[PDB]
Short mmCIF file of C-alpha atoms in Angstrom, two decimals:
data_model
loop_
_atom_site.label_atom_id
_atom_site.label_comp_id
_atom_site.label_asym_id
_atom_site.label_seq_id
_atom_site.Cartn_x
_atom_site.Cartn_y
_atom_site.Cartn_z
CA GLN A 55 62.61 -45.18 -59.03
CA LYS A 56 59.77 -45.19 -56.55
CA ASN A 57 57.46 -42.82 -58.43
CA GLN A 58 58.15 -44.75 -61.61
CA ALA A 59 57.09 -47.82 -59.68
CA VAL A 60 53.77 -46.10 -59.04
CA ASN A 61 53.31 -44.93 -62.63
CA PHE A 62 54.13 -48.24 -64.32
CA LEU A 63 52.13 -50.22 -61.81
CA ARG A 64 49.14 -47.99 -62.56
CA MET A 65 49.44 -48.66 -66.28
CA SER A 66 49.60 -52.34 -65.42
CA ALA A 67 46.28 -51.96 -63.65
CA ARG A 68 44.33 -50.25 -66.37
CA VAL A 69 45.79 -52.23 -69.28
CA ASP A 70 45.01 -55.38 -67.29
CA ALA A 71 41.40 -54.25 -67.04
CA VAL A 72 41.00 -53.77 -70.77
CA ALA A 73 42.73 -57.13 -71.17
CA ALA A 74 40.04 -58.71 -69.04
CA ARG A 75 37.16 -57.20 -70.95
CA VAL A 76 38.74 -58.24 -74.26
CA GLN A 77 39.02 -61.77 -72.86
CA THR A 78 35.32 -61.72 -72.13
CA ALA A 79 34.71 -60.47 -75.66
CA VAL A 80 36.58 -63.35 -77.28
CA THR A 81 35.06 -66.12 -75.17
CA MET A 82 31.67 -64.58 -75.80
CA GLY A 83 32.54 -64.78 -79.48
CA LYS A 84 33.32 -68.50 -79.33
CA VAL A 85 30.10 -69.21 -77.46
CA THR A 86 28.10 -67.23 -80.01
CA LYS A 87 29.56 -69.01 -83.03
CA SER A 88 29.24 -72.48 -81.57
CA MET A 89 25.68 -71.74 -80.48
CA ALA A 90 24.79 -70.62 -83.98
CA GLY A 91 26.24 -73.93 -85.06
CA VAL A 92 23.97 -76.04 -82.87
CA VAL A 93 20.90 -73.98 -83.77
CA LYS A 94 21.54 -74.56 -87.46
CA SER A 95 22.57 -78.22 -87.57
CA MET A 96 19.73 -78.97 -85.19
CA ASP A 97 17.39 -76.99 -87.45
CA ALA A 98 18.19 -78.73 -90.72
CA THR A 99 17.95 -81.96 -88.76
CA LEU A 100 14.63 -80.67 -87.43
CA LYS A 101 13.26 -80.35 -90.95
CA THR A 102 13.49 -84.05 -91.91
CA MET A 103 13.00 -85.19 -88.31
CA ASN A 104 9.89 -83.02 -87.87
CA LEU A 105 7.79 -84.36 -85.03
CA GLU A 106 5.04 -86.04 -87.07
CA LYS A 107 7.42 -88.53 -88.68
CA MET B 1 21.56 -105.64 -86.32
CA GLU B 2 23.91 -106.05 -83.36
CA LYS B 3 25.30 -102.59 -84.05
CA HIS B 4 22.12 -100.90 -82.88
CA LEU B 5 21.90 -103.03 -79.75
CA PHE B 6 25.42 -102.02 -78.86
CA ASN B 7 24.72 -98.36 -79.49
CA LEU B 8 21.63 -98.49 -77.29
CA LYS B 9 23.44 -100.12 -74.37
CA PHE B 10 26.22 -97.63 -74.95
CA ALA B 11 23.84 -94.69 -74.82
CA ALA B 12 22.31 -96.06 -71.63
CA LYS B 13 25.61 -96.48 -69.81
CA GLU B 14 26.53 -93.06 -71.17
CA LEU B 15 23.54 -91.37 -69.59
CA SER B 16 24.19 -93.14 -66.32
CA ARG B 17 27.80 -91.93 -66.22
CA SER B 18 26.90 -88.33 -67.03
CA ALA B 19 24.17 -88.36 -64.39
CA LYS B 20 26.75 -89.64 -61.93
CA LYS B 21 29.06 -86.73 -62.72
CA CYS B 22 26.35 -84.11 -62.35
CA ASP B 23 25.52 -85.58 -58.97
CA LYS B 24 29.15 -85.53 -57.81
CA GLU B 25 29.46 -81.93 -58.96
CA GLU B 26 26.33 -81.25 -56.96
CA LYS B 27 27.95 -82.32 -53.69
CA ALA B 28 31.17 -80.47 -54.45
CA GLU B 29 29.01 -77.44 -55.20
CA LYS B 30 27.35 -77.54 -51.81
CA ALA B 31 30.78 -77.42 -50.24
CA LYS B 32 31.78 -74.56 -52.48
CA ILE B 33 28.61 -72.66 -51.48
CA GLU B 34 29.51 -72.96 -47.84
CA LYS B 35 33.00 -71.55 -48.48
CA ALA B 36 31.37 -68.75 -50.46
CA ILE B 37 28.77 -67.62 -47.95
CA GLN B 38 31.40 -67.87 -45.24
CA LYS B 39 32.76 -64.54 -46.49
CA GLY B 40 29.35 -62.88 -46.55
CA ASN B 41 29.10 -62.64 -50.34
CA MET B 42 25.45 -62.69 -51.37
CA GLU B 43 26.02 -62.88 -55.13
CA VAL B 44 28.55 -65.67 -55.67
CA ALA B 45 26.48 -67.51 -53.09
CA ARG B 46 23.54 -67.01 -55.42
CA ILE B 47 24.94 -68.34 -58.66
CA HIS B 48 26.58 -71.22 -56.81
CA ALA B 49 23.30 -72.11 -55.17
CA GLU B 50 21.73 -71.97 -58.59
CA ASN B 51 24.29 -74.26 -60.27
CA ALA B 52 23.91 -76.69 -57.41
CA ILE B 53 20.18 -76.89 -58.01
CA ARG B 54 20.40 -77.29 -61.75
CA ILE C 108 43.23 -41.15 -80.74
CA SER C 109 40.52 -39.55 -78.62
CA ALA C 110 37.98 -40.34 -81.32
CA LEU C 111 39.21 -43.93 -81.38
CA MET C 112 38.61 -44.00 -77.63
CA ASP C 113 35.02 -42.80 -77.47
CA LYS C 114 34.51 -45.26 -80.31
CA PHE C 115 36.04 -47.71 -77.85
CA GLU C 116 33.51 -46.92 -75.10
CA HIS C 117 30.57 -47.28 -77.47
CA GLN C 118 32.05 -50.50 -78.82
CA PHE C 119 32.47 -52.50 -75.64
CA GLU C 120 29.21 -50.97 -74.38
CA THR C 121 27.56 -52.83 -77.23
CA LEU C 122 29.56 -55.84 -76.08
CA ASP C 123 27.86 -55.64 -72.69
CA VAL C 124 24.35 -55.38 -74.11
CA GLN C 125 25.08 -58.34 -76.36
CA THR C 126 26.16 -60.25 -73.26
CA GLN C 127 23.06 -59.34 -71.29
CA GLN C 128 20.68 -60.26 -74.10
CA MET C 129 22.39 -63.55 -74.74
CA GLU C 130 22.22 -64.53 -71.11
CA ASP C 131 18.53 -63.64 -70.93
CA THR C 132 17.47 -66.00 -73.70
CA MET C 133 20.07 -68.59 -72.70
CA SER C 134 18.75 -68.58 -69.12
CA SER C 135 15.09 -68.54 -70.10
CA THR C 136 15.46 -71.60 -72.34
CA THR C 137 16.90 -74.00 -69.76
CA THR C 138 14.92 -72.42 -66.93
CA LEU C 139 12.73 -75.44 -66.30
CA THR C 140 15.72 -77.11 -64.70
CA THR C 141 16.21 -74.33 -62.13
CA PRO C 142 13.00 -73.42 -60.30
CA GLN C 143 13.06 -70.25 -58.22
CA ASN C 144 11.45 -71.90 -55.20
CA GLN C 145 13.97 -74.73 -55.06
CA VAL C 146 16.89 -72.29 -55.13
CA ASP C 147 15.25 -70.27 -52.37
CA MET C 148 14.95 -73.21 -50.01
CA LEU C 149 18.46 -74.32 -50.89
CA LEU C 150 20.10 -71.00 -50.22
CA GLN C 151 18.14 -70.78 -46.98
CA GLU C 152 19.18 -74.32 -46.07
CA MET C 153 22.80 -73.29 -46.38
CA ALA C 154 22.00 -69.94 -44.81
CA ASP C 155 20.84 -70.89 -41.31
CA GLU C 156 23.57 -73.49 -40.78
CA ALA C 157 26.10 -71.68 -42.97
CA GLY C 158 29.02 -71.37 -40.57
CA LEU C 159 28.00 -74.09 -38.15
CA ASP C 160 29.61 -76.95 -40.08
CA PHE D 1 -6.85 -83.56 -95.01
CA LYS D 2 -6.44 -86.97 -93.40
CA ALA D 3 -7.51 -88.50 -90.09
CA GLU D 4 -4.12 -89.64 -88.83
CA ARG D 5 -2.69 -86.16 -89.29
CA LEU D 6 -5.43 -84.81 -87.07
CA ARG D 7 -4.80 -87.39 -84.36
CA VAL D 8 -1.00 -87.29 -84.25
CA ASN D 9 -1.05 -83.51 -84.37
CA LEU D 10 -3.53 -83.34 -81.52
CA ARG D 11 -1.32 -85.51 -79.34
CA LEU D 12 1.72 -83.40 -80.20
CA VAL D 13 -0.30 -80.27 -79.44
CA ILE D 14 -1.20 -81.61 -76.00
CA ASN D 15 2.42 -82.40 -75.18
CA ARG D 16 3.56 -79.02 -76.53
CA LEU D 17 1.05 -77.00 -74.53
CA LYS D 18 1.95 -79.07 -71.49
CA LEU D 19 5.68 -78.30 -71.45
CA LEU D 20 5.05 -74.77 -72.59
CA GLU D 21 2.57 -74.33 -69.74
CA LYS D 22 4.88 -75.62 -67.02
CA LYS D 23 7.73 -73.51 -68.33
CA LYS D 24 5.63 -70.35 -68.52
CA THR D 25 4.71 -70.92 -64.89
CA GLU D 26 8.35 -71.13 -63.78
CA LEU D 27 9.35 -68.13 -65.85
CA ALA D 28 6.48 -66.16 -64.36
CA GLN D 29 7.65 -67.10 -60.87
CA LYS D 30 11.20 -65.90 -61.51
CA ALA D 31 9.98 -62.61 -62.92
CA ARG D 32 7.87 -62.21 -59.80
CA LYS D 33 11.19 -62.41 -57.96
CA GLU D 34 12.31 -59.52 -60.14
CA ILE D 35 9.22 -57.55 -59.06
CA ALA D 36 10.15 -58.16 -55.46
CA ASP D 37 13.55 -56.69 -56.28
CA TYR D 38 12.05 -53.54 -57.81
CA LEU D 39 9.45 -52.62 -55.18
CA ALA D 40 12.02 -52.78 -52.40
CA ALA D 41 14.38 -50.27 -54.00
CA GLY D 42 13.21 -48.15 -56.91
CA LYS D 43 10.05 -46.62 -58.30
CA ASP D 44 6.64 -48.25 -58.06
CA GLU D 45 5.62 -47.43 -61.62
CA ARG D 46 8.28 -49.50 -63.40
CA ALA D 47 7.37 -52.42 -61.16
CA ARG D 48 3.75 -51.88 -62.11
CA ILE D 49 4.20 -52.13 -65.87
CA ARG D 50 6.53 -55.06 -65.35
CA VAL D 51 3.75 -56.88 -63.52
CA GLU D 52 1.59 -56.07 -66.51
CA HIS D 53 3.97 -58.28 -68.46
CA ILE D 54 3.41 -60.78 -65.66
CA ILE D 55 -0.36 -60.64 -65.97
CA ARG D 56 0.06 -61.23 -69.71
CA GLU D 57 2.08 -64.41 -69.29
CA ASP D 58 -0.39 -65.54 -66.63
CA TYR D 59 -3.30 -65.14 -69.02
CA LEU D 60 -1.33 -67.21 -71.53
CA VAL D 61 -0.88 -69.93 -68.92
CA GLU D 62 -4.58 -70.12 -68.12
CA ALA D 63 -5.57 -69.93 -71.77
CA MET D 64 -3.18 -72.70 -72.73
CA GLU D 65 -4.74 -74.81 -70.00
CA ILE D 66 -8.34 -74.49 -71.15
CA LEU D 67 -7.34 -74.88 -74.79
CA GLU D 68 -5.33 -77.96 -73.83
CA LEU D 69 -8.53 -79.26 -72.24
CA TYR D 70 -10.59 -78.80 -75.40
CA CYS D 71 -7.85 -80.55 -77.37
CA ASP D 72 -7.98 -83.50 -75.04
CA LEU D 73 -11.78 -83.58 -75.33
CA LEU D 74 -11.65 -83.72 -79.10
CA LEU D 75 -9.07 -86.47 -78.74
CA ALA D 76 -11.35 -88.53 -76.50
CA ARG D 77 -14.42 -88.47 -78.74
CA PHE D 78 -12.06 -88.58 -81.72
CA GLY D 79 -13.40 -92.03 -82.49
CA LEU D 80 -16.72 -90.35 -83.23
CA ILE D 81 -15.46 -87.46 -85.33
CA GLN D 82 -14.22 -89.85 -88.00
CA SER D 83 -17.80 -90.74 -88.95
CA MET D 84 -20.25 -87.82 -89.13
CA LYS D 85 -19.92 -85.27 -91.93
CA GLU D 86 -21.49 -82.82 -89.51
CA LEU D 87 -20.18 -81.84 -86.10
CA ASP D 88 -22.71 -82.87 -83.48
CA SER D 89 -23.82 -81.10 -80.30
CA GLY D 90 -21.02 -82.46 -78.15
CA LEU D 91 -18.11 -81.15 -80.18
CA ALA D 92 -19.95 -78.00 -81.25
CA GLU D 93 -17.77 -76.01 -78.88
CA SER D 94 -14.15 -77.18 -79.00
CA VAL D 95 -14.22 -77.03 -82.78
CA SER D 96 -14.85 -73.29 -82.79
CA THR D 97 -12.67 -72.56 -79.78
CA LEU D 98 -9.69 -74.38 -81.21
CA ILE D 99 -10.12 -73.06 -84.76
CA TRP D 100 -10.45 -69.48 -83.61
CA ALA D 101 -7.45 -69.72 -81.31
CA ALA D 102 -5.08 -70.34 -84.22
CA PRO D 103 -4.05 -66.84 -85.27
CA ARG D 104 -3.40 -65.76 -81.68
CA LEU D 105 -1.12 -68.53 -80.47
CA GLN D 106 0.62 -69.48 -83.73
CA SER D 107 3.96 -68.02 -82.62
CA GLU D 108 4.22 -70.09 -79.45
CA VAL D 109 2.90 -73.21 -81.20
CA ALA D 110 2.84 -74.06 -84.94
CA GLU D 111 1.21 -77.43 -84.47
CA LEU D 112 -1.90 -75.57 -83.38
CA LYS D 113 -1.96 -73.92 -86.79
CA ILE D 114 -1.66 -77.22 -88.62
CA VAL D 115 -4.49 -78.67 -86.53
CA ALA D 116 -6.52 -75.54 -87.27
CA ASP D 117 -6.23 -76.28 -90.96
CA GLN D 118 -6.93 -80.00 -90.50
CA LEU D 119 -10.29 -79.18 -88.93
CA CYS D 120 -10.95 -76.16 -91.12
CA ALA D 121 -10.99 -78.21 -94.31
CA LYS D 122 -12.88 -81.15 -92.82
CA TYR D 123 -15.96 -78.95 -92.76
CA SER D 124 -17.79 -77.41 -95.69
CA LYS D 125 -20.45 -76.56 -93.13
CA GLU D 126 -19.86 -73.02 -91.91
CA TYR D 127 -16.09 -73.35 -91.82
CA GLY D 128 -13.40 -71.93 -94.05
CA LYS D 129 -13.32 -68.48 -95.62
CA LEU D 130 -16.01 -65.92 -94.66
CA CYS D 131 -18.12 -68.65 -93.08
CA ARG D 132 -15.17 -69.45 -90.83
CA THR D 133 -14.92 -65.80 -89.92
CA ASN D 134 -18.67 -65.95 -89.14
CA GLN D 135 -18.73 -69.12 -86.97
CA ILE D 136 -15.99 -67.83 -84.67
CA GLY D 137 -18.26 -65.60 -82.61
CA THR D 138 -19.72 -68.66 -80.87
CA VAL D 139 -16.53 -69.84 -79.16
CA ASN D 140 -15.92 -69.97 -75.43
CA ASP D 141 -16.05 -66.32 -74.41
CA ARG D 142 -14.16 -66.87 -71.18
CA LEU D 143 -11.19 -68.23 -73.12
CA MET D 144 -11.65 -65.34 -75.50
CA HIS D 145 -11.10 -62.70 -72.83
CA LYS D 146 -8.43 -64.65 -70.97
CA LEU D 147 -6.56 -64.76 -74.28
CA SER D 148 -7.47 -61.42 -75.88
CA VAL D 149 -4.84 -58.73 -75.62
CA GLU D 150 -5.97 -55.61 -73.77
CA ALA D 151 -4.44 -53.77 -70.84
CA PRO D 152 -5.95 -54.97 -67.55
CA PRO D 153 -7.83 -52.58 -65.25
CA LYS D 154 -5.27 -51.00 -62.92
CA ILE D 155 -7.06 -52.25 -59.79
CA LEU D 156 -6.14 -55.80 -60.76
CA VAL D 157 -2.56 -54.81 -61.42
CA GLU D 158 -2.27 -53.03 -58.10
CA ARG D 159 -3.76 -56.09 -56.42
CA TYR D 160 -0.96 -58.22 -57.83
CA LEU D 161 1.52 -55.63 -56.60
CA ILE D 162 0.00 -56.02 -53.14
CA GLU D 163 0.37 -59.79 -53.10
CA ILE D 164 3.85 -59.82 -54.62
CA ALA D 165 4.89 -57.22 -52.10
CA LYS D 166 3.59 -59.45 -49.34
CA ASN D 167 5.14 -62.82 -50.27
CA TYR D 168 8.73 -61.56 -50.33
CA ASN D 169 7.95 -59.24 -47.42
CA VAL D 170 8.46 -55.71 -48.64
CA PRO D 171 6.53 -52.70 -47.41
CA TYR D 172 4.11 -51.40 -50.00
CA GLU D 173 1.62 -48.53 -49.81
CA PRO D 174 -1.06 -48.96 -52.50
CA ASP D 175 -2.66 -45.69 -53.60
CA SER D 176 -5.87 -45.20 -51.64
CA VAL D 177 -7.27 -43.24 -54.59
CA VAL D 178 -7.46 -46.40 -56.70
CA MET D 179 -9.18 -48.59 -54.10
CA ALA D 180 -12.13 -46.20 -53.90
CA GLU D 181 -13.06 -46.44 -57.56
CA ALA D 182 -13.08 -49.52 -59.76
CA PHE E 1 8.31 -50.87 -91.21
CA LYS E 2 7.59 -54.25 -89.65
CA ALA E 3 6.26 -55.40 -86.27
CA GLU E 4 9.10 -57.69 -85.25
CA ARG E 5 11.64 -54.93 -85.80
CA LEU E 6 9.70 -52.76 -83.39
CA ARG E 7 9.55 -55.47 -80.74
CA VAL E 8 13.14 -56.72 -80.90
CA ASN E 9 14.42 -53.17 -81.00
CA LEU E 10 12.35 -52.21 -77.98
CA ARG E 11 13.78 -55.08 -75.97
CA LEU E 12 17.31 -54.15 -77.03
CA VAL E 13 16.58 -50.53 -76.12
CA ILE E 14 15.48 -51.56 -72.63
CA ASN E 15 18.63 -53.60 -72.07
CA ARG E 16 20.80 -50.80 -73.48
CA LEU E 17 19.29 -48.08 -71.31
CA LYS E 18 19.61 -50.42 -68.34
CA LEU E 19 23.36 -51.02 -68.55
CA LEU E 20 23.95 -47.46 -69.64
CA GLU E 21 21.97 -46.25 -66.63
CA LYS E 22 23.84 -48.35 -64.07
CA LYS E 23 27.16 -47.34 -65.57
CA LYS E 24 26.31 -43.64 -65.60
CA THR E 25 25.48 -43.95 -61.92
CA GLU E 26 28.87 -45.45 -61.06
CA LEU E 27 30.73 -42.94 -63.19
CA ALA E 28 28.84 -40.13 -61.49
CA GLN E 29 29.83 -41.52 -58.10
CA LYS E 30 33.52 -41.63 -58.98
CA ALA E 31 33.45 -38.08 -60.30
CA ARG E 32 31.83 -37.04 -57.03
CA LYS E 33 34.97 -38.45 -55.43
CA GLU E 34 36.90 -36.08 -57.67
CA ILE E 35 34.78 -33.18 -56.38
CA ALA E 36 35.67 -34.18 -52.85
CA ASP E 37 39.30 -33.98 -53.89
CA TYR E 38 38.92 -30.47 -55.31
CA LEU E 39 36.99 -28.76 -52.50
CA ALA E 40 39.50 -29.89 -49.91
CA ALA E 41 42.48 -28.33 -51.66
CA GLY E 42 41.95 -25.85 -54.48
CA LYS E 43 39.46 -23.27 -55.64
CA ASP E 44 35.72 -23.60 -55.17
CA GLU E 45 34.84 -22.38 -58.65
CA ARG E 46 36.47 -25.20 -60.61
CA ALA E 47 34.73 -27.68 -58.33
CA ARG E 48 31.48 -25.87 -59.02
CA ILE E 49 31.57 -26.16 -62.80
CA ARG E 50 32.75 -29.74 -62.45
CA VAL E 51 29.63 -30.51 -60.44
CA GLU E 52 27.71 -28.91 -63.28
CA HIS E 53 29.03 -31.77 -65.39
CA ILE E 54 27.80 -33.99 -62.57
CA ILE E 55 24.31 -32.51 -62.62
CA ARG E 56 24.25 -33.11 -66.38
CA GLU E 57 25.04 -36.81 -66.10
CA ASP E 58 22.50 -37.07 -63.29
CA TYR E 59 19.78 -35.60 -65.47
CA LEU E 60 20.73 -38.16 -68.11
CA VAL E 61 20.35 -40.94 -65.55
CA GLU E 62 16.88 -39.84 -64.50
CA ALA E 63 15.80 -39.21 -68.08
CA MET E 64 16.98 -42.62 -69.21
CA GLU E 65 14.96 -44.12 -66.38
CA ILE E 66 11.64 -42.51 -67.27
CA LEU E 67 12.20 -43.14 -70.98
CA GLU E 68 13.05 -46.75 -70.17
CA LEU E 69 9.71 -46.89 -68.37
CA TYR E 70 7.75 -45.65 -71.38
CA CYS E 71 9.56 -48.19 -73.54
CA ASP E 72 8.54 -50.97 -71.21
CA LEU E 73 4.95 -49.70 -71.24
CA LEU E 74 4.79 -49.78 -75.01
CA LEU E 75 6.25 -53.26 -74.83
CA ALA E 76 3.53 -54.45 -72.45
CA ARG E 77 0.55 -53.25 -74.47
CA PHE E 78 2.52 -54.10 -77.61
CA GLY E 79 0.00 -56.83 -78.30
CA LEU E 80 -2.56 -54.08 -78.80
CA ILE E 81 -0.48 -51.76 -80.97
CA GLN E 82 -0.34 -54.36 -83.73
CA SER E 83 -4.06 -53.90 -84.43
CA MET E 84 -5.33 -50.31 -84.43
CA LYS E 85 -4.30 -47.96 -87.24
CA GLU E 86 -4.74 -45.18 -84.72
CA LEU E 87 -2.96 -44.82 -81.40
CA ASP E 88 -5.52 -44.96 -78.61
CA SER E 89 -5.73 -43.00 -75.36
CA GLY E 90 -3.45 -45.31 -73.41
CA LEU E 91 -0.40 -45.06 -75.63
CA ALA E 92 -1.08 -41.44 -76.57
CA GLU E 93 1.81 -40.41 -74.34
CA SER E 94 4.77 -42.77 -74.71
CA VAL E 95 4.52 -42.50 -78.48
CA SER E 96 5.24 -38.79 -78.43
CA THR E 97 7.73 -38.95 -75.58
CA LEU E 98 9.78 -41.66 -77.22
CA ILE E 99 9.62 -40.18 -80.73
CA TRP E 100 10.65 -36.75 -79.55
CA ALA E 101 13.51 -38.09 -77.46
CA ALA E 102 15.32 -39.43 -80.52
CA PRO E 103 17.45 -36.49 -81.64
CA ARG E 104 18.66 -35.80 -78.09
CA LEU E 105 19.89 -39.23 -77.05
CA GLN E 106 20.97 -40.64 -80.43
CA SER E 107 24.67 -40.48 -79.55
CA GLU E 108 24.39 -42.60 -76.42
CA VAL E 109 21.94 -45.01 -78.08
CA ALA E 110 21.35 -45.68 -81.81
CA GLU E 111 18.67 -48.27 -81.23
CA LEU E 112 16.50 -45.46 -79.93
CA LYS E 113 16.80 -43.81 -83.32
CA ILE E 114 15.80 -46.95 -85.18
CA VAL E 115 12.79 -47.36 -82.90
CA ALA E 116 11.94 -43.70 -83.49
CA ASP E 117 11.72 -44.39 -87.20
CA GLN E 118 9.78 -47.64 -86.70
CA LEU E 119 7.04 -45.73 -84.89
CA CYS E 120 7.34 -42.62 -87.03
CA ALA E 121 6.38 -44.43 -90.21
CA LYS E 122 3.67 -46.55 -88.61
CA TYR E 123 1.58 -43.42 -88.32
CA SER E 124 0.23 -41.25 -91.11
CA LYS E 125 -1.79 -39.59 -88.38
CA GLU E 126 0.09 -36.51 -87.19
CA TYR E 127 3.50 -38.16 -87.36
CA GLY E 128 6.37 -37.71 -89.77
CA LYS E 129 7.56 -34.47 -91.33
CA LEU E 130 6.01 -31.16 -90.18
CA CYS E 131 3.18 -33.01 -88.46
CA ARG E 132 5.79 -34.86 -86.42
CA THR E 133 7.37 -31.56 -85.53
CA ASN E 134 3.87 -30.40 -84.48
CA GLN E 135 2.83 -33.40 -82.33
CA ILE E 136 5.99 -33.23 -80.21
CA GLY E 137 4.80 -30.39 -78.00
CA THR E 138 2.45 -32.79 -76.17
CA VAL E 139 5.13 -35.06 -74.68
CA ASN E 140 5.89 -35.50 -71.01
CA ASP E 141 7.12 -32.07 -69.97
CA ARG E 142 8.89 -33.34 -66.89
CA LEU E 143 11.06 -35.60 -69.02
CA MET E 144 11.50 -32.67 -71.36
CA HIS E 145 13.12 -30.47 -68.73
CA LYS E 146 15.04 -33.29 -67.06
CA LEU E 147 16.54 -33.96 -70.49
CA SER E 148 16.77 -30.47 -72.01
CA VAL E 149 20.19 -28.88 -71.93
CA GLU E 150 20.35 -25.61 -70.00
CA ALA E 151 22.62 -24.51 -67.17
CA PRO E 152 20.99 -25.20 -63.79
CA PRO E 153 20.23 -22.37 -61.35
CA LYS E 154 23.32 -21.85 -59.20
CA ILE E 155 21.41 -22.48 -55.96
CA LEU E 156 20.95 -26.09 -57.01
CA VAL E 157 24.60 -26.41 -57.90
CA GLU E 158 25.72 -24.94 -54.61
CA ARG E 159 23.35 -27.32 -52.84
CA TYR E 160 25.12 -30.26 -54.45
CA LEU E 161 28.43 -28.75 -53.38
CA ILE E 162 27.09 -28.67 -49.83
CA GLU E 163 26.11 -32.33 -49.83
CA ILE E 164 29.25 -33.54 -51.59
CA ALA E 165 31.30 -31.54 -49.13
CA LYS E 166 29.47 -33.24 -46.29
CA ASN E 167 29.67 -36.92 -47.34
CA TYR E 168 33.45 -37.00 -47.64
CA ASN E 169 33.74 -34.64 -44.68
CA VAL E 170 35.38 -31.48 -45.92
CA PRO E 171 34.72 -28.02 -44.55
CA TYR E 172 32.75 -25.88 -46.97
CA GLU E 173 31.45 -22.33 -46.59
CA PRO E 174 28.63 -21.70 -49.09
CA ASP E 175 28.22 -18.05 -50.07
CA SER E 176 25.52 -16.52 -47.89
CA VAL E 177 24.73 -14.12 -50.73
CA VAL E 178 23.29 -16.94 -52.83
CA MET E 179 21.08 -18.46 -50.13
CA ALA E 180 19.19 -15.19 -49.71
CA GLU E 181 18.00 -14.99 -53.30
CA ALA E 182 16.76 -17.81 -55.51
#
């Protein structure tokens, strides 16, 4: 029982780590998409709003 | 015509409120910096100092 | 499996470079609002008196 | 070409070069902080080429300042430029300096390009086409070198490394073999 | 080939080699911990070959650093390289060193390969094909040996075993028969 406690708990560690980096990957994804969104909408609204007018 | 007046006043009071928040966050962020550097962490202390400034 | 795993390393490695790049442009666009000098004097300000309260 | 386009675009160019100038200064500063990080830990060489990127952005700052000046000058006597079909002695400089600076800076600023056209087509006297390519030798030479892209002499670079080393207080030992020569 | 591809890819290459460098350092460290585990319990020999894997990853670290440098150099004078159809004296090094380093490092970094092409096809002067294979003798030789794959002389290995033994404080008795010779 004790050595199993060690083994499992170790798996918990490493799997948790990958879980963290995947988390970062997803949130990064959201930020990227949304940012693309603002760059575009702002761009097509920068074409008819171009500074001279 | 009133509609635009109301949107302008609204945008003004809007900007004031948001400014107010950023300021409040600033003070809270000073506090948080002190807690941070209390440990001796020179990195967290950095990005906190930075966010305080901005 | 092993192949899938080195593929894994390479993969999230690319995640990290994506991250780094993103944060470079993202922090060089808004950078007018965070001078270096200001941050220096701030961090110093809370350095000397740091634990004095 | 129209007059109002020229005016409005000049004012937008001034604003643009202003913000862009300030920002390039701050960015330069921060990167200087990076230099200070390198010289205190790792190799000198990497730090050196990095401060070559620094010296580049610095030259862009200075250049943008003098060019900004000439823009403002043209904007002040702008009342005059709407009359004569020939550029007079006073504006005989900023015309060439601004026109010639178009293909260099176009990436940072597009408005500079549009202004460049607006002037380019206002003159059938030695501007446009091959004549344009032949009037552009007479510009401000100082601005020309400040702007022109060539690797600086390493003594200048190593000087910057000295100063940067000093401000953030890191020990630096500049090669004594460089100081002797030029 | 285009210019912007070259630039963007160089900047991505710098970032890539940066993270990859840092990470290889940490990984190396941890494996050194493994060495410390071996020498204190089991055979020396196993530990020895293991630290040959160490010396490999170390050479990759160093190599990636100098190559990173040359990349940054090309990126600094990059304003110049967009003009001349012929590489001048200044860049006459990093061109060859970066081009030649493509087939070695391609697995760790693909962007290095794409850059390698981007330069390769920008020159019809002694680059590409058999001419490419014939200009690649002139690269930085130091980088060439740091990178090239050959088993290190066992004195170097056994030196590393000495140091590693010391840092984690384990008794080690290096063969006195090796120290005599080279």
